[PDB]
Amino acid sequence: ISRKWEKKNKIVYPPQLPGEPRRPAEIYHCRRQIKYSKDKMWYLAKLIRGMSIDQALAQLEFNDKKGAKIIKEVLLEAQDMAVRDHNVEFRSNLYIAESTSGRGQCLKRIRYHGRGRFGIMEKVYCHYFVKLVEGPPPPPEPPKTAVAHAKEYIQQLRSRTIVHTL
Amino acid sequence: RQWKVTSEDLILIGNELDLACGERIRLEKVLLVGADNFTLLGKPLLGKDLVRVEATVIEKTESWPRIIMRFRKRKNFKKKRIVTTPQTVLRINSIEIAPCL
Amino acid sequence: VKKGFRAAFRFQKELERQRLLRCPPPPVRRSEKPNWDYHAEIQAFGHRLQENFSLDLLKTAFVNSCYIKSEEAKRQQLKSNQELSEQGTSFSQTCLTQFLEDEYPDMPTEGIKNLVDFLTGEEVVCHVARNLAVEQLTLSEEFPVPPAVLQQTFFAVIGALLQSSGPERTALFIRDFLITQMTGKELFEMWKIINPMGLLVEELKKRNVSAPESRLTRQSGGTTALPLYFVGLYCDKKLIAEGPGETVLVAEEEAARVALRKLYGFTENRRPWNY
Amino acid sequence: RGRIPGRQWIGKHRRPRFVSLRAKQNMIRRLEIEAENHYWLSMPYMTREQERGHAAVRRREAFEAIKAAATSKFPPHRFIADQLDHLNVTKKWS
Amino acid sequence: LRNRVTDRYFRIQEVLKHARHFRGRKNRCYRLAVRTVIRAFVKCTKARYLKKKNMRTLWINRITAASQEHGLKYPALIGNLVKCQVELNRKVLADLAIYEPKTFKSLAALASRRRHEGFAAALGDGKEPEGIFSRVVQYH
Amino acid sequence: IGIRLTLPPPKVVDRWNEKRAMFGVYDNIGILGNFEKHPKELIRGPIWLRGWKGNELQRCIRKRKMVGSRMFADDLHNLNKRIRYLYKHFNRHGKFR
Amino acid sequence: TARGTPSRFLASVLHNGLGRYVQQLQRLSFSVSRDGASSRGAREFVEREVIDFARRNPGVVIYVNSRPCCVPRVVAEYLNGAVREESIHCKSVEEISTLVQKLADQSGLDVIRIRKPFHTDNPSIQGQWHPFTNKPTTFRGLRPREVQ
RNA sequence: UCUCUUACUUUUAACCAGUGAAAUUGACCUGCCCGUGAAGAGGCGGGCAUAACACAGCAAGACGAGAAGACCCUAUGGAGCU
RNA sequence: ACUGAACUCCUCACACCCAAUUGGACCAAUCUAUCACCCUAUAGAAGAACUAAUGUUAGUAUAAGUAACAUGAAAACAUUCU
RNA sequence: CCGAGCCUGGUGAUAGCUGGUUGUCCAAGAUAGAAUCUUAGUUCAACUUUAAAUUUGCCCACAGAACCCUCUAAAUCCCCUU
RNA sequence: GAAAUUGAUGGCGCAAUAGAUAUAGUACCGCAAGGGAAAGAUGAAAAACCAAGCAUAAUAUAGCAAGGACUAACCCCUAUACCUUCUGCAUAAUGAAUUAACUAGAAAUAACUUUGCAAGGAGAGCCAAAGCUAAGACCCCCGAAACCAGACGA
Ligand SMILES: Nc1nc2c(ncn2[C@@H]2O[C@H](COP(=O)(O)OP(=O)(O)OP(=O)(O)O)[C@@H](O)[C@H]2O)c(=O)[nH]1
Ligand SMILES: [Mg+2]
Ligand SMILES: [Mg+2]
Ligand SMILES: [Mg+2]
Ligand SMILES: [Mg+2]
Ligand SMILES: [Mg+2]
Ligand SMILES: [Mg+2]
Ligand SMILES: [Mg+2]
Ligand SMILES: [Mg+2]
Ligand SMILES: [Mg+2]
Ligand SMILES: [Mg+2]
Ligand SMILES: [Mg+2]
Ligand SMILES: [Mg+2]
Ligand SMILES: [Mg+2]
Ligand SMILES: [Mg+2]
Ligand SMILES: [Mg+2]
Ligand SMILES: [Mg+2]
Ligand SMILES: [Mg+2]
Ligand SMILES: [Mg+2]
Ligand SMILES: [Mg+2]
Ligand SMILES: [Mg+2]
Ligand SMILES: [Mg+2]
Ligand SMILES: [Mg+2]
Ligand SMILES: [Mg+2]
Ligand SMILES: [Mg+2]
Ligand SMILES: [Mg+2]
Ligand SMILES: [Mg+2]
Ligand SMILES: [Mg+2]
Ligand SMILES: [Mg+2]
């Protein structure tokens, strides 16, 4: 097994110079061996990607999926450790930069079928990962306007060369 | 081959020319010499006293590996060969014309 | 476990390669890396450029003031290249001015100055030094060498060449290594100008020619999103130049640029430089 | 619609094929070349009696060369230098 | 397991390196990657003939375009240049059409000149004086 | 993944231990000792292949003939079956006949 | 293949031929071994050819390092910053000589597919063709069907 | 039963939540018509069509999955019976 | 008249496109004898090389988050009701 | 899972039948029939491969190779020269 | 397929799909005989980057998914997966989901090449009208329905 996500919290950056932008705090948290399918967990992860901590908690509190409660607990733990250990000043000033689900260690069981035949059940387990970044959530990527899209087309037109000649 | 050439041009000849790099050469088979307002055409080759094209052997190299692959379905016929073709890059230094028309 | 060592060794080497690619090492000056000898490298520099540099002068040119300060600080815990760089810069400017004025007698003094500034600028000189290995032989207190220090070292090398071989050989060196940098470049790519129509009007007034008249020579797809406008400047009902553009204003500006190029003798089809 | 029964070009009911002006011209060109060949073959220089034996010597010498090549096949020579040169694989510096 | 293969990683990589840019499992699975890579190499080998053929086709198309601009058809231009004894090939002719329009106009004028000289000779069949541009420089 | 991620432990071979140093000694015992002993008498190993060589069938036949009575029950059964199979293979199967 | 490999255009390091030819190769590091059959040819090259090559090419610094090696190598460093490492493992004197001469005559530019066998910074002398070339002009610039 | 099918209830079903198989699977970026062809094309030729994606149905095709066809023939292949 | 092959010419180089079968030159890795000592050389050996056997074992996919499975109701969770 | 049980052993049964038969490169390489419980196979021949010895090999000028049968095909065999 | 007769100190082994089936004849399977597995890896002390599959990161018209290319991923042009079998397969004939590991040419006679010695060769035997001695090279894997013997089963 691999446990690099936990280790990611132990990297210490060199002290920043006075004339340097303040580095946003990054907190890596995870929960391992959740009795839940990673495919089902991925939907919740994708839902909360890119949102503020408070918005993600609010969305999860009112979601009927089992994984929602687990993700809410993980997010609360991440917030607590960010405030206590990673010198994050405000609880709410955190956004989910990364949220993914990974395959866990799964157990194999037998499903009995009708004619002495069988299938191999998989007691599925999944991991859950979160990175919380300090600061307001990055603004959503604006849809590209007609002006920008036509500008791209004209750039493509200008990029044309006389191919296969001097 | 026939190359359309001008001063400061680079030409990639697909073989070794048996010349040390940085050595000056005269390209003797000039079919056409042209300017903004006039062009002179050979029948089929222009005169030495009319045109002098000079080049310099800038580089001697081997081409990037070329794959020669032969395959026939359902015959256990598969063959592969890697070939690198010698090459020489020449820089055309000058194209000089003389009043001998 | 499979008995054997050679496959494992190959895999270890490949893992090292992948590790290096994923985490590239910080750049280090070639002096630190193995297989380096300063005297041999500098002699090879001279022979490669095919010039009889005096070794002491070349070493003085390569050594910079910042290197001296750093070395003194380290000693706490040498003649710089200032004069050589000044001499080389002055000679390069004067010789490039001579070349450019001889080649383009109609070019204005401002144009010649701008071309000389382009040729002796940080970008061109830095590129030439980097590809001539001046950086490797450069003694500085930080790596990679900053463009200013690299330019100073390159001009110090030129000054050392002047003091060793003479003005003629130095002029040949400049012609070979800086004048060549204007090949394929465009006049206003090297000399940035604003209001080319104004410049053209001024030049024509100095030459005693009637003010140019813009005239739409050709047009295509005027009402579309991709128009073409060939606008020609006519003096005394005579075409001095014509330029294409997307809009009429852009076409007129480009036609003014073409007219300026023709007047200054820096046309694309001009006589190639004679080396 | 417009099916040719079976395989085209082989069966009793084949796809019709029509000669183009191009094909006719090509065949006529080849026919002209062969007519010129007939003309140039219709004028022998020597007669059979005149040619009899005029190349016998050269043909015999050529076959003698072939026979010599065939009968000279023998294993190649072997030299002590070749055998002793293998000792150089462990040639080292000092 | 007296003797076992220990290089199979590198043996697989020698093939997968050329399949990394494929789509789907053909860029990951050796069983599929090897087939796709063999096909790609065969295509690359066979594509040189097509490269030359398409280069000549492109040159012919461009020469046709320029000759039509000057009012001549490609067969006329090529045949009459040959008759003028100018041995410019199609690559060079297309390059001239693109980058030296005035030179190509001169060449088209020469081709039309020779074409009209040939027409005049055919019309006035006989021992009339040969066209000025129809004279052929003999070599020995 | 069939390749180890670490270099195997260095393998040191003593080229000058007693066995290697004295290897080959007395191989010329016969020619250099009035032929009192044949070099094949220097071969230490199974009794049925001391100074003798043959294919698998011949080796099995010799083993059964020389030590078959002293073999274990299942080992002797295996040897008999191997002899049978090798007989059939060598006398009835093959490209050349 | 071309689509599976990077490509570049024909070019020179600093317009290598306009003013004067400059040998792009600057450094040649020969890692050789006193013992080991792999470097027999390298040893013979160092004995009989390296001196001649060095004097023939005075602009190239050659560093012959004799250390324990199973695979003797030659590292060629070019003015442009390119490094080409070639194995001279079990190569005869002639093979090593040819390889070294090829490195000397070769520029530092990458050995990849070259898109065009030629490179011109001034492809046009008479004016690059545009749609309005070979098109006559009309009186007062009147487009077709224009009334006035 | 049918002419001639309709209405409702339960299960099933569809959506939400938990748990979670099976055959199958060369790779697929997996269209229609005509022609071709190892003799019945999604992949070939000529045309036509063609932003990308889910969800629910259908069973015309993928010579669909399933069982190395039980029919038929062969094997100096078996076995049962007379 | 032109277009048109891997035919032919052209510049350089050439052993470098037939199934079964056959001849030959090299060679990955392993061990052994001597070398070598950031991966090797000369030889001797052999369980000596896998895109394919409805191949064996193990892992993980597709089908699929699909087919299927489950807890009568309220409540003080004492109890009551259907 | 009984036209004759199941397990173990002989047993790696045998199979003219099906399937599979793993590094690189070059070269030569498609060709009459006979016999056979034999036509799904094999031996001989023919062809093919390799190495070796030797000298004629192929193409082919006249001349020449049947009457039955009154006439009658493309051709063939043989064959110096070349 | 004889007999007379002759005389007679470890590893160019495996190293957890290997080597014993074996961590065990245990677990499990079968009424019974009987069949029969899998696997573990820290450190001196614990009293201290790489398979497949996915995710980061769904997708754009068109097509064995690539090649020629190109400024440009696609758009343009060219291109009927592989293996086996066959007269002939893109074939709508077989096999294959994919990754890792394992998985299949054994040898005599006579020849050929290379040595040694030579009317003799060979370390008894055998061969010899240049032979003889030695070496090199030289022939696969899975699969039946079956048959028989002895046990186990109402
Ligand atoms: N070939 C072989 N030699 C063995 C074996 N076991 C022991 N030996 C040899 O027996 C010799 C003596 O063994 P040691 O253990 O040293 O001494 P030991 O205990 O007196 O020996 P034994 O009397 O044989 O029990 C050595 O030469 C060993 O190599 C074996 O299984 N095979
Ligand atoms: Mg599953
Ligand atoms: Mg048909
Ligand atoms: Mg559900
Ligand atoms: Mg059809
Ligand atoms: Mg649907
Ligand atoms: Mg249905
Ligand atoms: Mg299909
Ligand atoms: Mg079916
Ligand atoms: Mg069947
Ligand atoms: Mg029946
Ligand atoms: Mg029978
Ligand atoms: Mg052609
Ligand atoms: Mg094997
Ligand atoms: Mg494998
Ligand atoms: Mg398989
Ligand atoms: Mg799923
Ligand atoms: Mg479904
Ligand atoms: Mg359901
Ligand atoms: Mg039963
Ligand atoms: Mg069998
Ligand atoms: Mg062949
Ligand atoms: Mg006896
Ligand atoms: Mg085991
Ligand atoms: Mg992976
Ligand atoms: Mg199929
Ligand atoms: Mg079949
Ligand atoms: Mg299938
Ligand atoms: Mg009872």
CATH number at residue A64: 3.90.470.10
Which residues from chain B sit within 8 angstroms of residue G102, using beta carbons? 60-62
Give residue numbers, 20 to 59 of D, with CB < 7 Å from strand J. 48, 51-56, 59
| CA angle (C66, C72, C78) in 5-degree steps | 70
Residues near F3 by Cβ (< 8 Å), separated by ≥ 6?
Answer: C7, C8, C11, E6, E8, E9
Beta strands in chain C (DSSP E): 213-220, 228-235, 238-245
Max CA distance (Å), chain F: 60
Among candidate residues G4, G11, G16, the one with its CA nearest the CA of residue G115: G11
A interface residues, C as partner, C-beta within 8 Å: 150, 154, 157
Among candidate residues A110, A100, A104, A120, the one with its CA nearest the CA of residue A42: A100
Which residues from chain G sit within 8 angstroms of residue B58, using beta carbons? 12, 16-17, 21, 107
Rounded Cα distance between F77 and F59, Å, is 16
And the tokens for A35? 């009795």
Q: What is the 3-state secondary structure (H, E, C) of chain E?
A: CCCCCCCHHHHHHHHHCCCCCCCHHHHCCHHHHHHHHHHHHHHHHHHHHHHHHHHHHHHHHHHHHHHHHCCCCHHHHHHHHHHHCCCCCHHHHHHHHHHCHHHHHHHHHHHHHHHHHHHHHHHCCCCCCCCCCCCCCCCC
Rounded Cα distance between E58 and G65, Å, is 55
Distances (CA, A) of F39 to B41, D91, F50: 92, 35, 11
Handedness of CA C261, C264, C270, C272 (dihedral sign): negative
Rounded Cα distance between G94 and A143, Å, is 65
Q: What is the 3-state secondary structure (H, E, C) of G103-135?
A: HHHCCCCCCCEECCCEECCCCCCCCCCCCCCCC
The residue in chain B having the minimum alpha-carbon distance to the alpha carbon of residue C274 is B94
Q: Are the beta carbons of G37 and D90 separated by less than 8 Å?
A: yes
Q: Are the beta carbons of G35 and D88 separated by less than 8 Å?
A: no
Rounded Cα distance between C14 and C10, Å, is 6
Residues near E83 by Cβ (< 8 Å), separated by ≥ 6?
Answer: E114, E118, E134
Q: Name the residue range of residue A104's domain.
A: 1-166
Rounded Cα distance between G54 and G94, Å, is 16
Chains D and F touch (3+ CB pairs under 8 A): no
DSSP secondary structure code for residue B64 in this structure: P
Distance, CA of B10 to chain centre:
9
Rounded Cα distance between G75 and G100, Å, is 10
Specify burial of residue G124 (Cβ count, 10 A radius: 0-12, 13-18, 19+).
middle
Handedness of CA C84, C85, C89, C90 (dihedral sign): negative
**Which residues, in sequence order, are bridge partners of residue A129?**
A30, A100
Specify burial of residue A65 (Cβ count, 10 A radius: 0-12, 13-18, 19+).
middle
Core vs surface per residue A98-116: b (16+ CB within 10 A) or e = ebbbbebeeeeeeeeeeee
Helix, strand and coil percent figures for chain F, each rounded to 5: 45, 0, 55
* Positions on chain K within 7 A of a protein C-beta: 9-11, 13-16, 18, 41, 49-56, 64-72, 74, 77-79, 81-86, 89-91, 96, 98-103, 105-108, 113-115, 123, 138-141
| CA angle (C136, C142, C143) in 5-degree steps | 45
And the tokens for C166? 């003479």
Calculate how far, in angstroms, residue F54's C-alpha sits from the geometric centre of ligand 19: 71
Rounded Cα distance between B13 and B85, Å, is 10
Identify whether E101 is preceded by a cis peptide bond (ω within 30 of 0): no
Q: Are the beta carbons of B31 and E44 separated by less than 8 Å?
A: no
Q: Name the residue range of residue F36's domain.
A: 1-96
And the tokens for C40? 């041999």
Among candidate residues E48, E59, B10, the one with its CA nearest the CA of residue A165: E59
- List chains adjacent to chain B, taking adjacency as at least 3 C-beta pairs closer than 8 Å: C, E, G
| Element of type H or E holding D66 | helix D56-71
Distance, CA of D34 to chain centre:
21
Among candidate residues C263, C242, C261, the one with its CA nearest the CA of residue C251: C242
Identify whether A24 is preceded by a cis peptide bond (ω within 30 of 0): no
DSSP secondary structure code for residue G140 in this structure: G
Q: Are the beta carbons of C272 and B7 separated by less than 8 Å?
A: yes
Q: Count other C-beta atoms under 10 Å from residue C41's C-beta.
A: 18
Rounded Cα distance between C161 and C275, Å, is 19
| Element of type H or E holding A79 | helix A66-84
And the tokens for B1? 């081959």
Which residues from chain C sit within 8 angstroms of residue E10, using beta carbons? 7, 10-11, 14
Q: Are the beta carbons of C225 and A150 separated by less than 8 Å?
A: yes
Q: Is the CB of D14 under 7 A from strand H?
A: no
Report the structure determination method: cryo-EM
Distance, CA of F7 to chain centre:
34
Among candidate residues G14, G21, G43, G42, the one with its CA nearest the CA of residue G105: G21
Domain covering G1-148: architecture: 3-Layer(aba) Sandwich (3.40)
Rounded Cα distance between B51 and B45, Å, is 10
Task: Please identify which residue in the block is written with the tokens 């990297």.
Answer: A11
Among candidate residues G85, G147, G109, the one with its CA nearest the CA of residue G9: G109
Nearest nt (C1') from E45 Cα: K67
Distances (CA, A) of E51 to A87, C146, E44, E46, E55: 64, 46, 10, 9, 6
CA at E117, C1' at I76: how many angstroms apart?
122
Calculate how far, in angstroms, residue B13's C-alpha sits from the geometric centre of ligand 22: 33
Number of domains present in the structure of chain A: 1
Beta strands in chain F (DSSP E): none
**Which residues, in sequence order, are bridge partners of residue C229?**
C219, C245
Chains C and B touch (3+ CB pairs under 8 A): yes
Rounded Cα distance between G62 and G44, Å, is 16
G interface residues, D as partner, C-beta within 8 Å: 34-37, 40, 43, 66
Q: Collapse the DSSP code of A135 into the 3-class scheme (helix H, G, I; strand E, B; otherwise coil) and give the result.
A: coil
Q: Are the beta carbons of E89 and B70 separated by less than 8 Å?
A: no
And the tokens for C167? 């003005």
Q: Are the beta carbons of G11 and B34 separated by less than 8 Å?
A: no
Q: Count other C-beta atoms under 10 Å from residue B5's C-beta.
A: 21
Specify whether the CB–CB gap between C66 and C161 falls below 8 A: no
Backbone angles phi, psi at F77, to 5 degrees: -60, -45
Q: Is the CB of E127 under 7 A from strand H?
A: no
Domain extent listing, chain E: 1-140
C-interface mutation test, from E2, E6, E102, most C Cβ less than 10 A away: E6
Helix, strand and coil percent figures for chain G, each rounded to 5: 25, 20, 55
Distances (CA, A) of C202 to C195, C207, C210, G72: 11, 9, 11, 69
| CA angle (G128, B59, C33) in 5-degree steps | 120
Handedness of CA C65, C67, C68, C74 (dihedral sign): positive
| CA angle (A55, A61, A66) in 5-degree steps | 125
Pairing verdict, β G73-78 and G83-87: antiparallel
CA at E27, C1' at H31: how many angstroms apart?
27
Rounded Cα distance between E83 and E74, Å, is 14
Helical H segments across F4-72, by residue range: 18-21, 56-67
Among candidate residues G86, G76, G87, G88, the one with its CA nearest the CA of residue G27: G76
Residue type, E31: R
Specify whether the CB–CB gap between C128 and C57 falls below 8 A: no
Pairing verdict, β A107-112 and A94-103: unpaired
- List chains adjacent to chain D, taking adjacency as at least 3 C-beta pairs closer than 8 Å: G
Helix axes F73-92, F56-67, angle to 10 degrees: 150
DSSP secondary structure code for residue F37 in this structure: S
Rounded Cα distance between B96 and B92, Å, is 11
CA at A115, C1' at H77: how many angstroms apart?
34
Rounded Cα distance between G42 and G48, Å, is 10
How many residues comprise chain A? Answer: 166
Backbone angles phi, psi at C3, to 5 degrees: -65, 140
Backbone angles phi, psi at E49, to 5 degrees: -60, -45
Backbone angles phi, psi at A100, to 5 degrees: -145, 160
Q: Are the beta carbons of C7 and F11 separated by less than 8 Å?
A: no
Among candidate residues C101, C123, C258, C103, the one with its CA nearest the CA of residue C186: C258
Rounded Cα distance between E39 and F45, Å, is 56
Resolution in A: 2.7
Rounded Cα distance between C129 and C148, Å, is 11
Among candidate residues B39, B47, B55, the one with its CA nearest the CA of residue B95: B55
Chains D and E touch (3+ CB pairs under 8 A): no
Pairing verdict, β G61-66 and G25-32: parallel
Number of domains present in the structure of chain F: 1
B91 interfacial to chain G (CB closer than 8 Å): yes
Rounded Cα distance between A124 and A40, Å, is 11
**Which residues, in sequence order, are bridge partners of residue A98?**
A131
The residue in chain A having the minimum alpha-carbon distance to the alpha carbon of residue C226 is A154
- List chains adjacent to chain F, taking adjacency as at least 3 C-beta pairs closer than 8 Å: C, E
Q: Phi/psi class of residue B91: alpha, beta or left (left: φ > 0; alpha: ψ in -120 to 50)?
A: beta
Nearest nt (C1') from C16 Cα: K49
Q: Phi/psi class of residue F44: alpha, beta or left (left: φ > 0; alpha: ψ in -120 to 50)?
A: beta
Q: Is the CB of F77 under 7 A from strand J?
A: yes
Distances (CA, A) of A44 to A34, A65, A81, B36: 14, 8, 22, 70
Among candidate residues A130, A40, A2, the one with its CA nearest the CA of residue A77: A130
Distance from CA of D6 to the nearest CA of G (A): 42
How many residues comprise chain D? Answer: 94
